[PDB]
Design a protein around this ligand. Structure first.
Ligand SMILES: CCCCCCCCCCCCCC(=O)OC[C@H](COP(=O)(O)OCC(O)COP(=O)(O)OC[C@@H](COC(=O)CCCCCCCCCCCCC)OC(=O)CCCCCCCCCCCCC)OC(=O)CCCCCCCCCCCCC
Ligand SMILES: CCCCCCCCCCCCCC(=O)OC[C@H](COP(=O)(O)OCC(O)COP(=O)(O)OC[C@@H](COC(=O)CCCCCCCCCCCCC)OC(=O)CCCCCCCCCCCCC)OC(=O)CCCCCCCCCCCCC
Ligand code: BCL
Ligand SMILES: CC[C@H]1c2cc3[nH]c4c(c3C)C(=O)[C@H](C(=O)OC)c4c3nc(cc4[nH]c(cc(n2)[C@@H]1C)c(C(C)=O)c4C)[C@@H](C)[C@@H]3CCC(=O)OC/C=C(\C)CCC[C@H](C)CCC[C@H](C)CCCC(C)C
Ligand SMILES: CC[C@H]1c2cc3[nH]c4c(c3C)C(=O)[C@H](C(=O)OC)c4c3nc(cc4[nH]c(cc(n2)[C@@H]1C)c(C(C)=O)c4C)[C@@H](C)[C@@H]3CCC(=O)OC/C=C(\C)CCC[C@H](C)CCC[C@H](C)CCCC(C)C
Ligand SMILES: CC(C)=CCC/C(C)=C/CC/C(C)=C/CC/C(C)=C/CC/C(C)=C/CC/C(C)=C/CC/C(C)=C/CC/C(C)=C/CC1=C(C)C(=O)c2ccccc2C1=O
Ligand SMILES: CC(C)=CCC/C(C)=C\CC/C(C)=C/CC/C(C)=C\CC/C(C)=C\CC/C(C)=C\CC/C(C)=C/CC/C(C)=C/CC1=C(C)C(=O)c2ccccc2C1=O
Ligand SMILES: COC(C)(C)C/C=C/C(C)=C/C=C/C(C=O)=C/C=C/C(C)=C/C=C/C=C(C)/C=C/C=C(\C)CC/C=C(C)/C=C/C=C(\C)C(=O)O
Ligand SMILES: COC(C)(C)C/C=C/C(C)=C/C=C/C(C=O)=C/C=C/C(C)=C/C=C/C=C(C)/C=C/C=C(\C)CC/C=C(C)/C=C/C=C(\C)C(=O)O
Ligand SMILES: COC(C)(C)C/C=C/C(C)=C/C=C/C(C)=C/C=C/C(C)=C/C=C\C=C(C)\C=C\C=C(C)\C=C\C=C(C)\C=C\CC(C)(C)OC
Ligand SMILES: CCCCCCCCCCCCO[C@@H]1O[C@H](CO)[C@@H](O[C@H]2O[C@H](CO)[C@@H](O)[C@H](O)[C@H]2O)[C@H](O)[C@H]1O
Ligand SMILES: [Fe+3]
Lengths: 124, 69, 271, 179, 39, 60, 38, 335, 69, 52, 56, 57, 56
């Protein structure tokens, strides 16, 4: 999803369009609304590409992407043939998860409630 | 009765009607925006089933409505 | 020194505070009680700004930044090294701007003119006060103000704008931007019209007041008056600042979500 | 030689103090610029500012009160005269002057339209002409015109300057500070 | 309406999170954690 | 070279043009009311007084 | 503009319109030969 | 109670509508006779007079209406031709530029061809309107100051064509839409690294604010001396009266220096023109000379230091590296 | 014709020229943006090799980086 | 015929020509945007193979 | 009821009526065109039994 | 009863009445069209038993 | 036919014609330069059988 150039001068290393930047903007607006936060929660908007100027939450957010890519690829999607047709989509595919599935508009799920510490069967 | 020689009754009546109407609208809308007196939705409930604001509450553990500073 | 016609206009009277003591001219400047107060506040604020630059890591003009305090000191005067200096500078700036407006009022009361210029400057003063006083008070902390730095206050503007996801969708911001753009367009048109009438095609005489109206009627079908263009320019320029103050004061104190979502009301009209 | 104003002290930058009456002497906000002693013209070489009686084509827009025959209340809440004629600007159609007949009549004075305020900002009943600058007694000192059909730029400036200077020199509390 | 603000960046940068107090309280109150089962 | 780039060059060209423009407009600002009246004599700031300018009037 | 001037202008306008209008017909026939659209 | 503030006019004076100065009418003529609006006459002049129409004006109207029709019809087709959705969703609708992979080659009609047609017609009509403004100015023997201010506006407008051509893709152009063109503004600033650090953007902002400052000052000054005949600025320029003298002295006593009644309009003209000229330069420099304005600002010492908000480990720096955005998936995979 | 007495030929000629110009430009541009009649690129194809029936609202990818060009 | 004493023929004809041109443009555009009647690309298809 | 024309100018009445009628006709035609059931440009050749119907 | 027209211009009353009536009719028709039960362009062929009904308690 | 010059000023007609012709020539040259087949500055040395052709 990166669009910003790591140089002062243009080159062929980055040829991102303004349209791709708009796509990233839409995805990040969705992420912000899924956590009930604004852009400055994970960004210093004076330079969106910087990780050192951004709060640590950004690092966490990136891992939340990777986890989702695993969950949606290896657990939820392969469950396509199990669901009845009323559960699938208009293309007949299994439902998938996003950030708001756990977060439901909060910076932490259930405001950071701890529940699995008292249920060892769910630990990994 | 000599108060009316001090202020024009036309102006006083205009200000009175305007202020009283604005106050009535504001009170009705404050009540309608509340939880206990949202009468259009929950007006059929009895006085015992109507919502009541929470009393002196207790604390919580490892749970914050606000993100850390 | 003095202009060729200046001497007959330099008389006594018209001040609001003080008498013959503060009724003199320092060079071209007029000094009153509010001129003295303006000098006091300007000197103190500028010296404190230089001290804030000295406390900081650089003397570079673009990188100097005197920042407001943390939000945890809400509405209290923070320690000087942790944002209190910003608060003192803000007090100095408020005093200086008020004194500038009142000194302008004294000057206009002395030349027989109307009181329009101080009130026009009051719009900008109100915008600044909304930025550093009204909005931080409504939000409950002096740390909601912007830092005093040439490029650091741009960073503050950027981050505050992205605090509402997409600040372009603020309706009052859209109205204020329209006011600014229309003001620039009208200023270009007025300057061009006056210059083109007083500096016509070479060899031709200086145009008259009917030429202006005839030209703009030929071009657009309507020509506002000579007084009308100045009224419109004043209204546009001052309304830009007023709508800017409105747009910034509703973000946070009244609206805390993303601005695009605010347009739900339009999509949910019963029709 | 014509600056009837003595310096307050010998320190440079000091304010001047008028000796006689500033309104007619022409110092401070009562001063005027020496413009040409010829009338202002239109595109067709006609007098730009003329009374309505000299041009029947002009009229008053329907919806606007007719100021003629209205009392002119002065700064001291004293009626100084009555409006009898309107001078209009022919190049740009607008009300520019009000001809006021004095209480004792026998003369007429010109009143700039920019110094005229209407009651309730012209929203409610408009039955009097408010002039906050000059008091009723000073209307008799407004400089006269050479003719009654045209007004030169010099007279224009003189009348405007006389009316403008009374925002500081009408009463004694006006040139004095508020504290 | 009071706004709960949480500072997330350096002072003066404009990096803050704003929340409306009333709806935040209502949203937090409505959450009901199931009680942990006895071990 | 490396530190110098096109944006910097264009910026300094704009600065030069802007200063020239400010000089020209200040020259125009002194077409009325000059030279100044001072005890030391006639005074002209920088830029100095411009030449006298006359307009064109239509014949009668 | 008199009636005779209108007659004289109409003659030239009609002939120029005809020539233009179906020089366009030749163009359309050439384009149809090259790549028909129906 | 209050002094007359010259904000509104209470007594309007009517007369025969002004036909206009005699001008050449071989290629165009004036339409209408001149009507009067009372509400318009409250604030300024009241005559909705005749309007001149000639060759350039008619051609500009035709081309501009064609562009407007193309934009509107594409917007209407984007909601499935629903008039209710057309009105309800109007601020969100757009006519979108072509895809990035076509570069400067002509795109498909439904994927950017209409956009280029509309842009071309709008450009032609704007240039024809410039010609019309020039001719209306020269027909009255006026100077051509308004044409050359409109030229600065057109220069800024034309950078929205020239910068996408210089970077090499029509996809970078501004979409025709109320909200989407604001979306493009935001995404343009983000893509090239915080346009706040573009020096010419800062310059143009300075000139825009200065235009507001100058118009507020000039309007207040003229309104404050309108009681002395100050609004008639032509005569105050050719025969300086007491209104111009007081206007000069107010600002001389206030800020130590002043202008004249004529040169304040030079100040205004140049501030307004420079607003768009420096902005056009700034846009032309983006993506062709500088690709990250924040990094250019760091290079030239524009960026203030802040304490680090996060520190990354050696493995985190390798892990947190991402990938540049590519193409969207054209398949719906089954897992 | 009498149509020239009601309408001055001077004005209608300019309106007519403008209308024909905009119409011809519109049609040539529409043809240039089509697959079947993009003659500058595919004009050398015969009628049997020319594309047919290729409306396809998403005939090309919408999202991609810029080319090296 | 007497309608033309109540309405100016010049203005009526100008309005008619403008409205009819706009209507023709709108209809041709709607057809061109459709799938069934995109004749620049579809025109050589027979009616049976045209989209429905 | 001819006297209505003495209270209202026939010219302005007819102009306003023509404008209102044209706008109304356009709105109805486009409401129908945007619907699923009455597109008539894509699905006009469908019979009444094959045309779409809203959900029960 | 007919003295009402001596206080209000009948010409200026009929125009306002027609405008208000047209606006009200359009608003009601559009509210019905934007609903689910009364979207008659799509579901107008349904019977009253097959027509949608809003969610109950 | 020459009488058209009594209806239209030759000076204005020539200026408008020259402007239109210059704009048309520049537009055509630019359209050709932006194309693949006729971008003559880069690929003008290719033979007619080597020049790009649109997809068949
Ligand atoms: C950006 C572009 C730049 C651009 C810079 C370059 C261009 C500047 C252009 C300025 C305008 C045109 C020139 C002009 O006319 O100037 C006025 C004056 C001539 O005045 P005048 O025509 O004689 O009129 C004076 C008249 O009113 C009589 O005044 P008087 O002499 O009676 O006293 C008036 C003042 C001064 O009082 C004094 O006693 C003066 C001597 C002592 C001064 C210091 C006293 C304080 C203690 C010691 C401090 C110092 C101890 C070390 O009296 C007043 O009341 C007026 C002043 C305000 C008082 C109230 C405020 C009090 C608190 C002040 C705190 C801060 C100041 C200390 O001219 C001159 O002095 C000529 C030389 C130029 C002076 C400015 C030079 C600035 C250099 C800056 C270098 C660095 C630049 C970055
Ligand atoms: C779409 C794309 C475009 C997008 C961007 C577009 C930006 C447009 C910028 C336009 C700038 C001028 C604006 C303006 O006032 O226009 C009015 C005027 C029409 O006036 P008019 O209709 O003829 O009216 C006659 C008369 O009323 C004019 O009086 P006005 O007061 O309006 O103008 C005053 C004149 C007085 O002229 C002089 O005194 C003669 C000397 C002027 C300076 C010559 C050298 C300039 C530098 C050259 C190298 C410049 C190198 C950059 O003054 C002016 O019009 C401008 C006064 C100066 C403005 C500031 C200059 C600052 C220079 C600083 C330089 C650095 C110092 C360190 O229009 C003109 O074009 C006037 C000039 C006409 C003569 C031709 C000049 C050029 C000849 C060589 C090129 C020939 C064609 C290839
Ligand atoms: C997140 C968004 C970005 C940002 C992105 C941009 C971009 C991108 C641009 C600007 C530009 C500008 N920005 Mg910004 N900007 C931001 C923050 C700001 C802030 C602020 C307080 O934060 C301010 C005050 C400004 C102010 C300014 C202006 C000084 C400048 C535009 C002048 C202008 O438009 O004149 C108005 C004049 C025009 C638009 C010229 C064209 C007018 C044409 C000729 C009119 C034709 C009308 C046509 C005929 C009408 C009919 C059409 C129908 C369809 C037929 N920016 C942040 C950093 N800004 C521009 C610039 O110059 O940047 C260097 C620019 O392109
Ligand atoms: C109608 C509102 C618009 C407007 C109008 C306006 N401005 C005006 C006036 C008017 C009508 C004046 O008459 C007045 C004037 O006298 O101008 C010459 C003025 C003025 N507008 C000014 C500037 C200005 N106006 C701005 C805005 C606008 N002004 C609005 C768009 C801006 C913007 C947008 O940023 C600026 C920078 C001044 C030139 C002048 C007021 C002069 C004044 O107040 O002087 C007293 C102060 C000093 C001499 C020095 C500062 C003293 C402080 C204590 C120092 C500390 C400052 C603080 C640290 C802030 C740092 C900010 C960082 C971001 C850099
Ligand atoms: C100094 C820079 C500033 C500036 C200057 C400037 N602009 C100028 C000028 C100047 C000096 C002119 O001379 C010129 C002018 O004539 O101004 C009055 C112009 C102009 N500035 C304009 C706009 C404008 N200026 C802007 C900006 C600015 N202009 C800068 C701030 C902006 C912004 C902020 O984006 C805009 C939008 C125009 C008013 C005008 C140029 C007009 C032009 O080129 O018109 C071409 C004609 C058309 C496109 C025809 C369109 C027809 C209709 C719009 C559509 C059809 C409508 C239909 C008939 C009815 C409605 C629909 C129905 C379904 C109901
Ligand atoms: C009835 C009704 C419905 C009302 C609703 C209105 C509402 C609700 C409004 C909100 C109310 C609230 C709570 C808001 C707070 C508003 C406040 C705080 C009001 C402030 C009042 C006010 C008039 C503002 C400033 C007061 C002024 C102008 C002070 C000047 C005092 C004065 C004349 C003294 C001179 C000394 C000054 C000014 C000091 C500065 C100064 C100092 C300090 C020197 O040492 C010095 C030494 C040598 C030379 C100069 C100076 C110099 O200038
Ligand atoms: C006690 C007390 C507080 C009272 C004081 C009063 C108060 C409260 C303060 C002010 C508050 C008030 C009353 C404000 C409300 C003002 C109101 C009612 C609104 C006005 C809105 C209005 C007039 C219009 C909106 C403007 C908009 C949106 C668009 C502008 C478009 C535009 C570019 C217009 C320009 C028009 C034209 C054609 C001008 C060209 C033109 C130019 C540019 C010339 O230079 C010139 C010079 C000389 C002759 C001719 C001309 C000329 O006509
Ligand atoms: C993709 O599909 C989309 C596009 C979407 C679908 C769209 C479809 C639409 C809507 C099409 C519209 C078509 C249309 C109608 O609207 C088309 C109308 C065409 C017409 C009528 C063309 C007429 C041209 C006339 C010409 C060239 C005349 C020239 C005359 C000449 C040279 C003579 C002049 C010289 C003279 C007189 C000198 C003598 C003077 C004398 C003696 C004197 O002066 O005295
Ligand atoms: C998807 O589809 C959607 C779009 C959704 C569905 C659409 C639905 C809608 C609402 C459609 C609307 C249709 C409509 C509206 O009413 C249609 C109305 C059409 C009409 C009225 C057409 C009328 C045409 C008239 C013409 C051409 C007249 C020509 C006259 C000529 C040639 C005479 C010339 C004059 C002369 C010579 C005089 C000489 C001078 C003389 C004698 C002198 O000077 O004396
Ligand atoms: C009733 O409904 C109909 C449809 C009949 C009429 C209604 C129409 C409506 C409602 C229209 C609404 C229009 C709106 C809302 C428009 C909004 C426009 C906005 C906000 C635009 C903002 C910015 C756009 C910019 C800056 C665009 C710039 C484009 C440029 C510079 C394009 C240049 C293109 C060129 C020169 C193309 C050349 C062609 C080449 C040479 C490339 O040919 C191959
Ligand atoms: C599309 C929606 C409509 C857009 C147009 C809206 C037009 C009206 C808004 C612009 C004018 C607002 O009018 C505004 O009135 C306020 C009073 O409330 C005036 O007063 C305001 O500024 C002054 C300036 O010092 C302050 O002293 C004062 O306390 C403050 O209220 C403003 O000077 C004037 O600008
Ligand atoms: Fe002016």
């Amino acid at each position: 999803a990166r669009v910003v150039t790591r140089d002062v001068a243009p080159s062929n290393a980055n040829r991102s369009s303004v349209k791709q930047t708009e796509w990233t903007y839409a995805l990040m607006i969705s992420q912000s609304r899924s956590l009930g936060v604004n852009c400055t929660y994970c960004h210093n908007t004076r330079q969106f590409a910087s990780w050192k100027e951004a709060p640590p939450a950004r690092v966490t957010a990136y891992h939340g992407i990777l986890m989702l890519r695993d969950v949606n690829q290896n657990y939820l999607s392969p469950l396509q043939p199990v669901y009845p047709s009323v559960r699938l989509g208009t293309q007949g595919d299994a439902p998938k998860a996003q950030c708001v599935t756990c977060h439901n508009g909060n910076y932490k799920p259930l405001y950071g409630a701890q529940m699995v510490k008292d249920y060892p069967a769910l630990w990994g | 009765h000599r108060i009316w020689l001090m202020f024009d009754p036309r102006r006083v009546m205009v200000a009175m009607v305007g202020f009283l109407a604005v106050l009535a609208l504001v009170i009705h809308f404050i009540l309608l925006s509340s939880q206990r007196y949202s009468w259009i939705e929950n007006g059929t409930l009895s006085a015992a089933q109507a919502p009541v604001g929470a009393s002196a509450p207790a604390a919580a553990a490892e749970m914050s409505p606000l993100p850390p500073g | 020194a003095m202009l060729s016609f200046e001497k007959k206009y330099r008389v006594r009277g018209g001040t609001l505070i003080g008498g013959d003591l503060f009724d003199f001219w320092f060079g071209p400047f007029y000094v009153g009680f509010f001129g003295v107060t303006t000098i006091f506040f300007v000197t103190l604020g500028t010296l404190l700004c230089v001290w804030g630059a000295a406390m900081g890591p650089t003397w570079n003009l673009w990188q100097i930044s005197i920042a407001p305090p943390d939000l945890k000191y809400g509405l209290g005067l923070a320690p000087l090294r942790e944002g209190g200096l910003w608060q003192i500078i803000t007090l100095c700036a408020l005093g200086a701007f008020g004194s500038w407006a009142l000194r302008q009022a004294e000057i206009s009361r002395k030349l027989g003119m109307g009181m329009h210029i101080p009130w026009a400057y009051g719009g900008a003063v109100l915008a600044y006060a909304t930025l550093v006083v009204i909005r931080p008070m409504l939000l409950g902390a002096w740390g909601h103000g912007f830092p005093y730095g040439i490029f650091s206050h741009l960073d503050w503007v950027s981050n505050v704008g992205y605090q509402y996801l997409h600040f372009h969708y603020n309706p009052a911001h859209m109205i204020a931007v329209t006011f600014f753009f229309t003001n620039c367009l009208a200023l270009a048109m007025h300057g061009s019209l006056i210059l083109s009438v007083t500096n016509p095609k070479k060899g031709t005489p200086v145009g008259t007041s009917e030429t202006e109206n005839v030209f703009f009627r030929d071009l657009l079908g309507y020509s506002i008056g000579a007084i009308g263009i100045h009224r419109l320019g004043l209204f546009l320029a001052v309304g830009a600042a007023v709508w800017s103050a409105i747009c910034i004061v509703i973000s946070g104190p009244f609206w805390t979500k993303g601005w695009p979502e605010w347009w739900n009301w339009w999509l949910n009209l019963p029709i | 030689s014509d600056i009837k104003a003595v310096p307050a002290d010998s320190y440079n930058g000091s304010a001047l103090i008028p000796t006689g009456d500033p309104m007619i002497d022409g110092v401070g906000p009562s001063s005027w610029a020496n413009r040409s002693d010829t009338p202002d013209m239109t595109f067709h070489n006609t007098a730009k500012i003329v009374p309505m009686r000299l041009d029947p084509t002009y009229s008053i827009a329907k919806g606007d009160p007719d100021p003629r025959g209205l009392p002119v209340v002065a700064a001291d809440k004293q009626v100084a005269g009555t409006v009898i004629e309107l001078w209009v600007n022919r190049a740009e159609p607008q009300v520019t002057y009000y001809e006021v007949q004095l209480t004792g009549s026998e003369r007429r004075v010109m009143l700039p339209a920019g110094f005229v305020q209407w009651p309730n900002f012209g929203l409610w009943g408009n039955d009097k002409l408010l002039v906050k600058a000059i008091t009723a007694a000073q209307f008799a000192n407004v400089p006269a015109l050479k003719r009654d059909d045209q007004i030169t730029l010099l007279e224009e400036d003189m009348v405007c300057a006389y009316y403008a200077g009374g925002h500081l020199y009408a009463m004694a509390e006006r040139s004095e500070p508020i504290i | 309406t009071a706004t709960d603000s949480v500072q997330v960046g350096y002072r003066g940068t404009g990096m803050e999170q704003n929340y409306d107090h009333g709806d935040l309280k209502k949203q937090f109150a409505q959450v009901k954690i199931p009680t942990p089962l006895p071990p | 070279m490396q530190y110098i780039d096109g944006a910097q060059i264009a910026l300094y060209a704009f600065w030069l043009f802007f200063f020239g423009l400010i000089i020209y407009i200040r020259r125009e600002d002194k077409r009325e009311g000059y030279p100044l009246e001072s005890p030391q004599g006639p005074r002209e700031g920088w830029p100095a007084m411009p030449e006298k300018k006359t307009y064109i009037h239509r014949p009668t | 503009m008199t009636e005779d001037e209108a007659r004289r202008f109409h003659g030239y306008f009609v002939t120029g319109t005809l020539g233009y209008i179906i020089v366009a017909a030749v163009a359309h026939f050439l384009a149809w030969q090259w790549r028909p659209w129906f | 109670m209050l002094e007359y503030q010259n904000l509104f006019t209470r007594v309007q004076v009517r007369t025969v509508p002004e036909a206009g100065i005699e001008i050449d009418e071989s290629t165009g003529t004036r339409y209408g006779t001149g009507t009067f609006s009372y509400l318009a006459g409250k604030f300024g002049d009241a005559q909705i007079g005749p309007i001149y129409l000639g060759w350039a004006g008619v051609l500009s109207l035709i081309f501009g209406f064609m562009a407007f029709e193309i934009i509107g019809l594409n917007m209407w087709a984007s909601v499935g031709w629903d008039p209710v959705e057309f009105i309800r969703q109007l601020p969100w609708l757009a006519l979108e530029p072509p895809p990035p992979q076509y570069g400067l080659r002509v795109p498909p009609l439904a994927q950017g061809g209409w956009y280029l047609m509309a842009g071309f017609f709008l450009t032609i009509s704007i240039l024809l309107w410039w010609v019309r403004v020039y001719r209306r100015a020269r027909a009255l023997n006026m100077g051509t100051h308004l044409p050359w201010a409109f030229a600065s506006a057109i220069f800024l407008y034309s950078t929205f064509f020239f910068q996408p051509l210089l970077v090499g893709s029509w996809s970078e152009m501004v979409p025709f839409g109320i909200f989407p063109h604001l979306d493009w503004t935001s995404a343009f600033s983000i893509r090239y690294g915080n346009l706040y650090y573009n020096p010419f953007h800062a310059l143009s902002i300075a000139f825009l604010y200065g235009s507001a400052v100058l118009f507020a000052m000039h309007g207040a000054t003229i309104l404050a001396v309108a009681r002395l005949g100050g609004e008639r600025e032509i005569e105050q320029i050719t025969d300086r009266g007491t209104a111009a003298e007081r206007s000069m002295l107010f600002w001389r006593w206030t800020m130590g220096f002043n202008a004249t009644m004529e040169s304040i309009h030079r100040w205004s003209w140049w501030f307004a023109v420079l607003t768009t000229f420096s902005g056009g330069i700034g846009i032309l420099l983006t993506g062709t000379v500088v690709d990250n304005w924040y990094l250019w600002g760091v290079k030239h010492g524009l960026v203030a230091p802040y304490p680090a908000q996060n520190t990354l480990t050696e493995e985190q720096q390798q892990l947190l590296r991402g990938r540049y955005q590519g193409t969207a998936p054209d398949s719906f995979p089954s897992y």
